Amino acid sequence: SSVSALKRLERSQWTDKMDLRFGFERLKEPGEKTGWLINMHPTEILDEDKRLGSAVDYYFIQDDGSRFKVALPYKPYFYIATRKGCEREVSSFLSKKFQGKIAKVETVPKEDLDLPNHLVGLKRNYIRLSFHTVEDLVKVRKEISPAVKKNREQDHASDAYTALLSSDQLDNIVDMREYDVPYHIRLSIDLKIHVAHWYNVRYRGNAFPVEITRRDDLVERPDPVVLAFDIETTKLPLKFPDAETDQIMMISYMIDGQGYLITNREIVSEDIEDFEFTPKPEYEGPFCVFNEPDEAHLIQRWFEHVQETKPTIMVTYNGDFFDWPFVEARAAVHGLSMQQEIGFQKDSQGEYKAPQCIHMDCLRWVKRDSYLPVGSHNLKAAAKAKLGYDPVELDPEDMCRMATEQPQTLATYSVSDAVATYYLYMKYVHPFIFALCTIIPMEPDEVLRKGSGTLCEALLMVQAFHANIIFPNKQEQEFNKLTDDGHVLDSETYVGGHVEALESGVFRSDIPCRFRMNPAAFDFLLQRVEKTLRHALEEEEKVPVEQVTNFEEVCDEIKSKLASLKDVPSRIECPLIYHLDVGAMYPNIILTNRLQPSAMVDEATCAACDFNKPGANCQRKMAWQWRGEFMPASRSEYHRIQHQLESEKFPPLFPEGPARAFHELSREEQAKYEKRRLADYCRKAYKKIHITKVEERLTTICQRENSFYVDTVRAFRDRRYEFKGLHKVWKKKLSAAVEVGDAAEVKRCKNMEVLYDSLQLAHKCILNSFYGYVMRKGARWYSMEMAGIVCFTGANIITQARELIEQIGRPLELDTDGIWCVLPNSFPENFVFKTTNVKKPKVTISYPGAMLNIMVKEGFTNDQYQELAEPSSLTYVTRSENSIFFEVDGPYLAMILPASKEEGKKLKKRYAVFNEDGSLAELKGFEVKRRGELQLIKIFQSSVFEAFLKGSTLEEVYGSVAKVADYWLDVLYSKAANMPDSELFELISENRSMSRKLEDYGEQKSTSISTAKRLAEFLGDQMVKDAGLSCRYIISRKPEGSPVTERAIPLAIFQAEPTVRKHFLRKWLKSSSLQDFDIRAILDWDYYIERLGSAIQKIITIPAALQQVKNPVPRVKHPDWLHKKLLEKNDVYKQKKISELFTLEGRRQVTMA
Amino acid sequence: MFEARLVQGSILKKVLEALKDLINEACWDISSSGVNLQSMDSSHVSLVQLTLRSEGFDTYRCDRNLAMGVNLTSMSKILKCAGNEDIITLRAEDNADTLALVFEAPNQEKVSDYEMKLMDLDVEQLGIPEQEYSCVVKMPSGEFARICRDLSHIGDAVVISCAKDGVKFSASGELGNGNIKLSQTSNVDKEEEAVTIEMNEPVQLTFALRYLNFFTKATPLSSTVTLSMSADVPLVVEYKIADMGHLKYYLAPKIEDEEGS
Amino acid sequence: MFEARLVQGSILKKVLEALKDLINEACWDISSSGVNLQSMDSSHVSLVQLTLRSEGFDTYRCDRNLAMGVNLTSMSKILKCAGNEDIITLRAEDNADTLALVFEAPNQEKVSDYEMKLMDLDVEQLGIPEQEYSCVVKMPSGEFARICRDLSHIGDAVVISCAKDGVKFSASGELGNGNIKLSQTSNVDKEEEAVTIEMNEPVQLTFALRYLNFFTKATPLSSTVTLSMSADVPLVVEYKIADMGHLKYYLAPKIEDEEGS
Amino acid sequence: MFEARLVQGSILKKVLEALKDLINEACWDISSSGVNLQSMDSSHVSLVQLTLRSEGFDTYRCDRNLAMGVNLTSMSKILKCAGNEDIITLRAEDNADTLALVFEAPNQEKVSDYEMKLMDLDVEQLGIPEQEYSCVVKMPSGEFARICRDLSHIGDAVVISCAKDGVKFSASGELGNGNIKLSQTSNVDKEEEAVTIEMNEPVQLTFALRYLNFFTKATPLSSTVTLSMSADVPLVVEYKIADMGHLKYYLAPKIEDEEGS
DNA sequence: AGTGAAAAATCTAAAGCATCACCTTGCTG
DNA sequence: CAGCAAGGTGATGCTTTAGATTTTTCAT
Ligand code: SF4
Ligand SMILES: [Mg+2]
């Protein structure tokens, strides 16, 4: 036991001496000091009594450029649940059982979320168990977790048995919670410390603990010392770089815009010098050059450089996967331990953090949360898209060619990736995360690496502790679940947004399209447009009608437009594309509707709330569709067969293990075996075992909770709009300052401007991540009912808007975010208003937006809504709100919809809409580019999209699409006659990633497994044994009759000596009767032809066939269902009924018997 | 209190097999003169009525024109039960809500009894007068199935054209076409193989032959079928089922236009 | 050395055709008494017993008891080669890892030797009590197969009543309850097409139709199948083989508890 | 027009029913010898020969050696009018691309045309080698099929050995190896049961079990299969349609790299 | 250029159903 | 004494489905 304490104190001394050699002077002298917090880590620090005790050392930066650190010790703790009248006994027992391990145990009340009758004043009395140190916390938690688990199981069984009949002392513990919450999270929650704030640290002597306080009036943000290191190894071609044999020749890093590159001499043949690279004036850096004969002196030079610079923030691309393990092993070869010089250490999560430094990964940001496409979340595409320049790139497979002969190219590539990750960090990522952690209570390491679920978790953590709310523990995936019908479950969900594309084709402002039109809806519009504009003025602008002068004039102008449109109830007219995107329905629906997960009760649980008067006002009823897959095994049969399986014993997992009874197996393996036997039991007694059921369910949402979730999203979007207006005024100030041309005030204004942008982007992104948190599991505030209710109410609103645009035009595309429509231009959308307000003289209100606003106001405004007004006397005021705001888009120039190849099934989130000036506007969830995809269809598909806007009618625009389609089919039917072979060979590569040696899949045949066997028989087995390799391959045609997996020939057969390549292809061809060895012939030309054909079927021809237009290209066939619908549509002999064509005898319906 | 006895239950089996896949709900109605099938099909394109008259039942008795609305997509499973020659006793009541079926073995060894549940319906009824038809053709049922069901696969629509030479079936589809020509026979000895045609004027009607593929499966009822048609009027397919009654398919043609050029 | 001849191959085709669809394994017991296959199926709620007595085979002898548990689906897959008239033979050793099956034609020309990989599993002999059954009824196999396929459409369970007069099948469902009553047909000289009952006391037992539809897969095995049932006693389908032994299908009757009544 | 005349149409529909699976689309050659087609399967590894001589037909009318591009899957949906005894009529095609198909019932009172257009199917030409083969096994095809279908569903590959004491069909596959042996028949005079093997030297050939499953799906067309082989040459499977037609299966020999010996 | 696990969607072989052609057999001219 | 129609039987195309498999989607 003393050896572990010795190891921990040695580790603490190592971290302290590391901090002192990086300038973080531990505050021991008394007095005040200003600081700006940058990091947070738990580290055991001995107290005054020379006793073990945990602490967290905050790191502070000062504006003069001098850092320091401050340790603060506190007692780690959680809360446990106790039975009524059982608070003193359990505390006394656990204090006496672990004297010297528990600092303080006591009771403290916190309001819970699930307790019956809870909204009248009573509160739940929890008990804190606080320890001296975090390892004591871990030991006690793992000691108590099985005990409380079995206690929960036994009290659940006893309560169920008693309720069925009627209608280590540790007998009082019920449920222990907030166990997986980290220590520093708990401190940053309790004592209210975040990062990126200014604090007045006070420390008088060593007896008193350090005192810290927020000081937010110093809104200027200092610059931490940042450093952007990326590496490169001695990689031989067609090989994963080795973590032992390979070693660094070239790194670069960016210390606050100052470049330093470090290079070796045994690899680089001639020395390199300083240079400057500037693609944009904002990106620059002078690259200091260090040259050393040996790589040990390379790593020592880097070590002493970061010792003399002391960089608090270090940033890298794929640090936790490739950089740190490689440099750690490579330094351990030369006997320079990484846990003694820099600080970063191998943690239990597979990640790397230093006690004092920050380790950052821009890949995880640009993948998780930048909302860029999954197909291009690497660093080069982020440099092209976000930062807007083309980064310098080089093929890693042939880096040894210019390791000596062109070292300048290698140096340029290394410094270019370094400067790209550095500037991408400081421009977007750094202020974004620090704005995030203004309200997120953790260091940038974790909050960068966690998911959006954990960020929303931290937000609700903060405001739940503020509102004195005990947390729910993470949910338990309780198997053997049975619903009301008494069946076992396989998978159950809510229903998502039914994202469809009700029709497809080409829709442009210039093109005159059809309008089938119901005059009744325009009778309603003629009788309602006055109220429509009245509501638009009084609610959207929040201005009463008395402050406008030309109201009657614009109203009668709309009357004339609507009447002139009405006079012809069927048109061929030029539309405008009009994007009815209310914009993130889900937060708006939670705001309007007040979905709180605390009560959200059902029947027989609603009666607990004591203010449920017969005038039911809190009874918000909503509908959603529960779907579930179940086996038909009812309660009786499943009960019988579970006793049947209980009767005998079970095979032990351990070899030669003892027999175990039914009560001491793990739940997961017994559930797996029970499901396995029940599947082939019911397979021969019911004729069906996988039965889906999608039923309608009504759930009630309590309307008078303490309501932290709706309050957070409301006040949080409120601060979103406040910071958006602040960014607007400060961007006006920035434009004025850059027109004036001063030096320091423009710098301060730009600092505040990027501060406000990072704030508002962080707020917006976490607002549209509040839905991602509640959508899936792995969350404490996880309710299925929010996801179902919000998703189906969003679908309900979006489909009512669909049906109310169907009678006034041809709505276009239906989504779970917002409709796209095309409207007749005879509808008004803009005019010049004359209002009495001098500051705002003009009002521009789009009339269709106004009518959708008024109909959502009539239909889906919460009239049941409640609110607190005064807490002591339970004053609940009844209000009404509706923030579901259909903000609309301008008339877009073009829009193209794709269609599927299956009847009934419709595409999920696939379309394209174009920008008015002539460029592109928006894609979504679409096949422009994707990992593991052939490159031919991407370039074809982008070419078709970009060669599109010329045309005058539907036949003309489909002819212009057919022009580029005919060009591509001409250059692809020519079998690559006069086009470069390298471009095609890169164009038709297909790459599949394989890892986990060879035993992951077991015994199965896929294309990746077939290519693994092909490389196994190629030259050796070691090229298949090592994991994490992406194999590139092409489908051939010559072995006809084999399945698709066998014909996937890799490309290593294309990269050898030609004669032995011929030998390999004769081996893999199973014949030798040929004499030619052409590369173009072996390729499966028709396979790529039919893949491009399937793409153009999805994109062009089938979307054409759902319209009354000619087939666009006759050079491709069609699906048989499409061909028969096309042949059946155009016959006048099609259908004549009998009810309207011949006289019916009358009305008659059958009665009883 | 409805009772219908039938010594030849195979024809009831065959009529209720002949229209299971056509209609969804069975709008039967019993009366003193006989039982009628005033059922409206779901696709709402054609009409079929069965008329079982009192001269064919072994014991037929009714009280009034009671309408029966049992589901018929649940019906050709009870009527797949009895053998080819059992004795069928179909019973109903004026006040009880359970239809009854009783099948008796010919040698009296396997008696079966079936109950039923009842429910209401709501669907229109068509009324067609007795109008005189231009061309009437008499066809053996087996040859009628051989032509109809087997042109149903090459084609989707059929053209029934009657001229002075004879009746023809010009059915086209997605691959080709079939032009069935008929020749007159006069020196015939037996009526189940005799084809005789009543001529008034040349006519031509287009039909969805898919519905005739539904329709022709009543071949083993009566060995002779009569097809009568005029211009712009539902063609009648009439099966005279062995002096039990008759089954009529009124199928609506499709109007002719000058789409040739 | 184990050499077993049998002139007729029909019965030792149909026994394992009936055993094929219900059991996926086997535990062969070759003893001096004959051949046994006492097996459980996947559900472990029913028992199957193939008994082939030694004297039924023309030439059959043993020297020790063997318990060799090859699966049964593979055997009934491989043994379908010959016909129902072919002469069958099994050849094995005292410690054979793979047995052989010879199928000689009636003209002694088409001669086989078919072998398969063998494994072993848990071999257990559960209690087979020949308790005095309350109701034992013998019906022709064709009629019983027809009535089980008949009642499988209406519902998923049949309740069987044994009385002084005879047997009463009944099947309830959404098509309505259908009941089929058979009395003793002792008026014919053919016992193959007759039904015979022996009776102690009336009981009413409901059975699951997927398992009866798997039991009665042995349609051609016997001219008459007898089945015995008693209060809370498993149904014993006693497939009688005129050549040797028998086949036994034991099923525990499903009776619903008071969870809904 | 131009459909070959024959009083029966059983063969004309059943050969296309059997050929419909292996070959999707092919071309038909008419010459003074008769009708012929050489076709390849989907994977282009096996050849199928059908020769039906004009002198083997009733009587012959033609204009020239002509190749017709008619598909074999959708066109084999109109041939179910022509039963086992329906009569065709033949006449020269003058200038139209349409091939008809007239069907005459034995009553000689109802005709039916079937007009099909022509699409161009380009088929390669080659010369099939002919040589003296080591072993030819002539044996009735019904039992050939009922043995092949039951040794082919357990395995995936087959090895045939031609031996004097017996030709051996080793079924190499996952479940196990099983084999059939055929001696010389000496006590059966009737051709419908006897097996003969005209063989000179032993040889082993390897083939696919699925291919031998699909090849022998033309059993009602013929009565006796002959399998002809030599030292590592493609199998030649002969069916004879009376004395008027012959069909040949010519699948390539899939001999591995000295795996057999 | 992380992995890691769930999972909803997708692909493919196995089973259930009604249908089609054939074999067997009894009644009658 | 054989011709012919009725009943039973086995093969088969088709549709449904159950289990493996694949890409997605968020978790560290
Ligand atoms: S619906 Fe009303 S009464 Fe029911 S729990 Fe919610 S607030 Fe209380
Ligand atoms: Mg990197």
Short mmCIF file of C-alpha atoms in Angstrom, two decimals, chain C residues 71 73-83 85 101-103 105-117, chain D residues 139-140 143 146-147 149-151 153-154 169 173-186 188 193-195:
data_model
loop_
_atom_site.label_atom_id
_atom_site.label_comp_id
_atom_site.label_asym_id
_atom_site.label_seq_id
_atom_site.Cartn_x
_atom_site.Cartn_y
_atom_site.Cartn_z
CA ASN C 71 -27.64 -35.07 -36.65
CA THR C 73 -31.43 -33.16 -40.92
CA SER C 74 -28.32 -34.26 -42.81
CA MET C 75 -29.44 -37.91 -42.79
CA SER C 76 -32.89 -37.12 -44.16
CA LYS C 77 -31.21 -34.84 -46.70
CA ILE C 78 -28.89 -37.58 -47.95
CA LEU C 79 -31.30 -40.54 -47.79
CA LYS C 80 -33.83 -39.05 -50.26
CA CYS C 81 -31.82 -40.53 -53.19
CA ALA C 82 -33.58 -43.88 -53.63
CA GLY C 83 -37.31 -44.48 -54.06
CA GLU C 85 -39.44 -49.54 -53.68
CA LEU C 101 -25.99 -46.60 -46.72
CA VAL C 102 -26.46 -48.96 -49.68
CA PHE C 103 -29.55 -48.52 -51.86
CA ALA C 105 -32.61 -51.33 -56.98
CA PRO C 106 -35.26 -54.06 -57.42
CA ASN C 107 -33.29 -55.28 -60.46
CA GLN C 108 -30.13 -55.14 -58.28
CA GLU C 109 -28.52 -52.62 -60.63
CA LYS C 110 -28.80 -49.09 -59.18
CA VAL C 111 -26.66 -49.72 -56.09
CA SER C 112 -25.57 -46.94 -53.73
CA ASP C 113 -23.02 -46.24 -51.02
CA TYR C 114 -23.71 -42.92 -49.30
CA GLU C 115 -21.72 -41.69 -46.31
CA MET C 116 -21.54 -38.56 -44.18
CA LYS C 117 -19.53 -37.05 -41.35
CA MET D 139 -28.89 -44.64 -68.75
CA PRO D 140 -32.50 -43.51 -68.21
CA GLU D 143 -33.56 -41.81 -62.06
CA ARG D 146 -33.76 -38.12 -58.90
CA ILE D 147 -30.23 -39.16 -57.90
CA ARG D 149 -31.05 -33.70 -57.22
CA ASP D 150 -30.39 -35.62 -53.98
CA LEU D 151 -26.61 -35.80 -54.22
CA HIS D 153 -28.07 -30.35 -52.54
CA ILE D 154 -25.56 -31.64 -49.95
CA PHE D 169 -20.32 -39.88 -58.81
CA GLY D 173 -18.92 -30.75 -50.68
CA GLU D 174 -19.22 -29.34 -47.18
CA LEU D 175 -21.68 -31.83 -45.68
CA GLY D 176 -19.81 -34.94 -46.84
CA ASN D 177 -18.81 -37.13 -49.75
CA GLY D 178 -21.35 -39.57 -51.14
CA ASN D 179 -21.34 -41.57 -54.35
CA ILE D 180 -23.41 -43.80 -56.64
CA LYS D 181 -22.10 -46.71 -58.71
CA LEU D 182 -23.57 -48.30 -61.85
CA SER D 183 -22.49 -51.69 -63.21
CA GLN D 184 -23.54 -53.25 -66.53
CA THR D 185 -27.16 -54.36 -66.78
CA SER D 186 -27.52 -57.96 -67.96
CA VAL D 188 -33.19 -56.31 -68.05
CA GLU D 193 -34.39 -49.16 -67.09
CA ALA D 194 -31.06 -50.67 -68.23
CA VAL D 195 -27.71 -48.87 -67.93
#
